[PDB]
Design a protein around this ligand. Structure first.
Ligand SMILES: [Cl-]
Ligand SMILES: [Cl-]
Ligand SMILES: [Cl-]
Ligand SMILES: [Cl-]
Ligand SMILES: [Cl-]
Ligand SMILES: [Cl-]
Ligand SMILES: [Cl-]
Ligand SMILES: [Cl-]
Ligand SMILES: [Cl-]
Ligand SMILES: [Cl-]
Ligand SMILES: [Mg+2]
Ligand SMILES: [Mg+2]
Ligand SMILES: [Mg+2]
Ligand SMILES: [Mg+2]
Ligand SMILES: [Mg+2]
Ligand SMILES: [Mg+2]
Ligand SMILES: [Mg+2]
Ligand SMILES: [Mg+2]
Ligand SMILES: [Mg+2]
Ligand SMILES: [Mg+2]
Lengths: 259, 259, 250, 252, 250
């Protein structure tokens, strides 16, 4: 059921999801206040689904939801993670795509998916294929927030326009966006996207995390840079507190010290 | 209600709809076995909605459904015909378009609409805007069946492909067609379009009418050429009998004589 | 303030006293006095119309023609239309309407053009439409474009407005004020190609503040009746039973 | 279907619009006639076709627009001997030709090259002709088409068999047909000249270039003596190397 | 008929007797004996593999290399792969495989290529994939393309098939037979880039008749175990619990 899958996804709203490679990192994230973890194994090589042993370790390490990545289009990687009992699958462009023409028919799965998007056409096509959660594609591993900004702004600007525009112009808008019409109509009616949309890819600092929230993100994904710090527990907790208290500029100043 | 509007439209299936300019022609069409008539007023000029007096004359002349044309996008021509009690509105590219960017939001009307289409993307966008019936755009006033053939074949070929293709390829197909995704999915599930699709524009002979049926049309629209004959009643009845008995080649030979 | 007084109305092109009186009698809110290079009308025609009615009288000046506009002002016209239908006198600069006492109407096709005309001092706008074709399609295009762009401006994040202004070629402070007011600061009428009662009502349904119609009124066998039909359809633009009856015999 | 087409081999087929023209053609030695009505050009009034069929004892052909299923089915039902799925009529389908395989009546189709030829055959054509250039009286395009087809067959028949798929891909020819052409040393159906034959010398030229026969148009009946002209064309086509005879036929 | 016997199986690239036996023991349906210009393998290697197992043995010939293919045939290989991974000997013409007694496998990327290879005499097909990258994306592309094109051919109106054949560059009579049979006349295996148990099962889910895998099996610390994991995932391609367990430690 759609309502279940989305309701589950919606639970994470206002929070931070962290990339973790083992039980130790998993525990640190949970302890810092992460609402979930993304289990990762992460040179010209092919990036695939993680060794299921790693995903299993992470699932055993924490009580918060655990996510993992499947290559775009990789039906079997996705069915495997589903059978393993992960809480969410990220059909991720950061892994090497298995299918360069067709995304997964996520509607046919019981596990909820997260997908990336850069604009409202991509967002609505991912939702129509059955995505229960969205995120910016951003710019992974660069530490530059600029693409996550661009994507969150684009999606949000396009939503505002759709909500405000004459209803009889929406088919032309759907055609121009490559958006499924019925989803745009429902967006107009609801005044919002039907799923949460997190920032992801390039969130490097407390100020970055708070910025994405200020731009309308529903939460934040952060990467392994957390555990490149001299004190991952402090850094992880700093990202959590900035994402939550995203208008407390005195706090965020303090949190931004010694990075 | 959608189901009502479509069910009404679906009633005309297997039949001939004829363009008529007055009560006399209206009566001849009905008498020849037409399932409906299209009331028409039809030089570099602007072609608009018919004088309501003409539409009224036609509605008074016959007991079969009466259709009339509104310019593409002309909200008020359409609301006027609706208020007048016509049975269907044809939002027609044969009249001079009032809006070159946006079609009518046909969903907001109580009267059913017919729209033209040339391919499945156009068909599904017209349906999504609320069209209850479709037709080929054909090539009006030329008497050349070639475009009606092309459009009926295109729509039908694209439907067959959609019905047969892997479900997980349908979003890519929707994107390529500019088709609303949920409508394609439902087409795949139903094995057919959700509304009837008539041939229109260039049906000149009994053999033409039977051809469109053989190509999968749900019925035929014919133009004023009927009443350019020496014996409109005979010609109109010939078109009706060919459309119905579209595999009776001996009959169609006979009907094709003295044209 | 005087322009907004006309809102919901019909303005009729008239060439003489007789036409002008008919227009007034039909319920026109104003008349546009009218008369190869197309220039300002003979002042004699404009004065004939001014003396013939009590409703506001407008007249046309060539784009950029300072002296035509100052002459009309001196004549006591109520509004000047700086009109692209006359032959432009200046192809690079519009009039600085801020420097005149008489209010101006200008044409526009999009919100950039609208706000530039306003910033130059326009007190009233209209679509450029497509004059003398009887085809409503361009008026529809222009009215939809301006209105669509306004809705987006009203809805969008304030911090994205400067990019929008730069994209539109809009004066930023007008765009900001549009966002704050929820609308344009001046009325925007449909013009160019309104041929039928249904067309007039259509432009109102699309968000127009009123309608300019042309000399085709007087081409009909019963001008007064046709003039009245346009007025009644423009006012009562959602009364489809009325509009049906008015659409008969044109 | 093919053996019947082949019985026309070496003869002249004439366009005729009525029973009189039809009788003249038969009497002149035509092997068959093409019933015509002669703007959208469609299947002829069946009345005309029936008049022609009733007028002569030689085979009667008629035309159907390209892709017009029901026109072709109607002609079939009327008992015509052959249908010409003809580009000289206004095409009813600009994307797809008739599935001639599904009919009992034999079809003739036009072609300009061996790729077209084999595609038409694969769709079920029982006879081919050049497309030529109808109503110009200019033989040049019939020459082009007959030469092209025949040159491509000579090459196919002579070439290395392991090179035939590349040839088929290049021609857009169905591979099995090309392979059988190579095996047989020839096309599997007769191929007539059509479109622009104006003089006896033209008729004989087409045969000299390898045509199996000749289609000719209404120009025969535009002449001062149709019977004599028609006979001239028949004789020049049959006696296509008799240059003294063709000389005499070419007078007046 | 002999090719179809392999359906559902795994074929493994092997360079010597030892690898060959492991492959056989793992449940391979056949082995591909393998050894700058890349040519036919030293016949010594091919014979070593033929003597080492009882399952079918395939070997590679350069595209168009008549004599390499005749030599392999004379040697008693069970199948010849006319392979684009070797350096083509003829860049214009493939082998006339119709003239050989031994069955051939050929690569294809679309249904045009598939039917041309078949018409030349291929008894078996595979994707061209993207060899030695471990990236499954091109095998996915090719298998999806061929299968999508077949479904369309099977569904489409028969009278539109000649346009389709011309568009595809497909021999018409094969396309017609595909429509009638509902499928290709030969098996079509995935090849080039299958790296993991999940990849192998994915290609089966996409409609492949079987899977070719490369020397990466023997790069693992436990070849026999890995070989078995690929076999079991290819057969039991919808058992996600098994496939999960098999995906561990690669
Ligand atoms: Cl996309
Ligand atoms: Cl990142
Ligand atoms: Cl469209
Ligand atoms: Cl028509
Ligand atoms: Cl400007
Ligand atoms: Cl006008
Ligand atoms: Cl062709
Ligand atoms: Cl000719
Ligand atoms: Cl090829
Ligand atoms: Cl490989
Ligand atoms: Mg858990
Ligand atoms: Mg950059
Ligand atoms: Mg009635
Ligand atoms: Mg054309
Ligand atoms: Mg006054
Ligand atoms: Mg135009
Ligand atoms: Mg006979
Ligand atoms: Mg030439
Ligand atoms: Mg052996
Ligand atoms: Mg690539």
């Amino acid at each position: 059921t759609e309502r279940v899958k989305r309701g589950m996804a919606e639970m994470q709203k206002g929070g931070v999801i962290m990339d973790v490679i083992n039980a130790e990192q998993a525990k640190i994230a949970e302890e810092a206040g992460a609402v979930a973890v993304m289990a990762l194994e992460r040179a010209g090589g092919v990036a695939r689904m993680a060794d299921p042993t790693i995903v299993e370790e992470v699932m055993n390490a924490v009580s918060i939801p655990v996510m993992a990545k499947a290559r775009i289009g990789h039906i079997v990687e996705a069915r495997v993670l589903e059978a393993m009992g992960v809480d969410y699958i990220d059909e991720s462009e950061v892994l090497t795509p298995a299918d360069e023409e067709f995304h997964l028919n996520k509607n046919e799965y019981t596990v909820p998916f997260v997908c990336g998007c850069r604009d409202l056409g991509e967002a609505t096509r991912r939702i129509a294929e059955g995505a229960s959660m969205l995120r910016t594609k951003g710019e992974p591993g660069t530490g530059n927030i600029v693409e996550a900004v661009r994507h969150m702004r684009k999606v949000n600007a396009q939503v505002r326009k759709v909500v405000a525009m004459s209803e009889d112009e929406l088919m032309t808008e759907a055609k121009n966006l490559g958006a499924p019409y019925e989803l745009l109509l429902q967006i107009k009616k609801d005044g919002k996207l039907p799923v949460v949309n997190f920032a992801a890819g390039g969130v490097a600092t407390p100020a970055d995390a708070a910025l994405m929230m200020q731009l309308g993100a529903d939460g934040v994904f952060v990467g392994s840079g957390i555990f490149k710090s001299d004190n991952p527990a402090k850094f992880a907790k700093a990202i959590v507190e900035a994402t939550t208290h995203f208008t407390d500029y005195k706090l965020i100043a303090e949190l931004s010290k010694e990075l």
